[PDB]
Design a protein around this ligand. Structure first.
Ligand SMILES: Nc1ncnc2[nH]cnc12
Ligand SMILES: Nc1ncnc2[nH]cnc12
Lengths: 229, 229
């Protein structure tokens, strides 16, 4: 079995590497470093993509094409758009959208690109596994919509748009693109996020305070999933 | 020699296929169809990515990793931001930026992502070849900055931003991402565009009228470059 494990930032994968605690071979490709290891009879390939849609699309495509991963699990932090997602809370993305896509010049719905779709789906099986683990461990786990775009959201106005247009529960910058690539190649994908901020005027300061802890919370949960695979 | 040739839309590569006039093998991968042919001792791989940064990043990465292309030439249409770029006029991108990238929440310059750069460069050699061909054929060819983003621009306000923030000459939705992937893999890249509209309130109607002709103008020029490779 071969499992790809992705984060966007070094801070998001550092706890992943430490938690698995095995020897990793570092393999450079396409401006990324892939960490290849063996964990309980499974080959794991771990990398951070760097932030945003282009970075994450590239890295996910490399993972699939060059490393032959059979599933991709993403772990990282996100901004909350809903009251019931507090700092540190976990969410699994059931659907994702590229919230900054706009071809309204041609009267297309926002988020829509011709020959594509507004929403991208993730793995029913992996999401179901996540919910079972959360329940067993007495952890709250929201199953909902993630909006992804190439802006770090820090305004009430944009939050209101994401909630009204897309019914999004959280916002980040890589989930939709990772899930998109996985779907195009027929690779099961799960996107996990822990909340670092409220995507408002104070989002940057909140993110700075909570990045480490939220990154660890997500990583620890991802590890618990791999332990059941 | 192996050359990748990319457009974003079917309309942008149809004239490319027709102009080369050779037999193509159709090969599906990652939601794209790659057209593989032989033209004067060179293997050419032609595809359209579909619109936008995620689509084009995926396709370019597939071209490089799965097909082993040694250079990538992009051809398509774009919106003009400058008076001296009229409908049908050609531009080669010397530098490109992702104009919709915004991490100002952390006081980063617009267009900047940590561990990256605002501007992406293209092939000095290919751009120089393009200028020589244009000169020899009495064709105007601007060498300038392209701004790429996941919105089809159709407002004076956004045009003013692109010109002031990035000194952009044209706007489109794939150039920066294609060039970005090529640079990460050390693959020479040239991005060619023909103007279809003025990126203003009437951009959609202009695009509809001029897509076919502008797409052909770009394709014909791209072919003339390949004829010198
Ligand atoms: N507010 C926010 N916007 C985008 N990505 C984020 N990741 C964490 N917080 C975020
Ligand atoms: N106005 C515009 N905005 C973005 N991409 C374009 N391609 C052609 N015209 C465009």
């Amino acid at each position: 079995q071969k499992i790809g494990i992705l984060g966007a930032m070094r801070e998001e994968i550092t706890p992943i590497l430490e938690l698995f605690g095995v020897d990793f071979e570092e393999i450079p490709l396409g401006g990324n470093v892939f960490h290849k290891g063996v964990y309980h009879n499974k080959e794991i390939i771990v990398a951070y993509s760097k932030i945003g849609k282009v970075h994450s699309t590239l890295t996910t495509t490399s993972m699939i094409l060059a490393f032959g991963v059979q599933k991709v699990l993403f772990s990282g932090v996100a901004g909350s758009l809903v009251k019931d997602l507090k700092i540190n809370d976990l969410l699994v993305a059931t659907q994702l959208v590229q919230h900054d896509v706009d071809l309204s010049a041609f009267d297309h719905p926002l988020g829509f690109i011709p020959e594509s779709a507004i929403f991208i789906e993730t793995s029913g099986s992996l999401n179901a596994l996540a919910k079972k683990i959360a329940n067993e461990q007495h952890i709250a786990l929201k199953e909902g919509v993630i909006a992804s775009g190439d802006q770090f959201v820090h305004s009430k106005e944009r939050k209101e748009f994401l909630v009204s247009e897309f019914k999004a529960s959280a916002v980040e910058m890589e989930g939709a693109s990772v899930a998109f690539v996985c779907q195009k190649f027929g690779v099961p994908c799960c996107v996990l996020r822990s909340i670092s901020d409220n995507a408002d005027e104070k989002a940057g300061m909140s993110f700075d305070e909570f990045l480490e802890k939220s990154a660890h919370t997500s990583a620890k949960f991802l590890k618990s999933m791999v332990d059941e695979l």
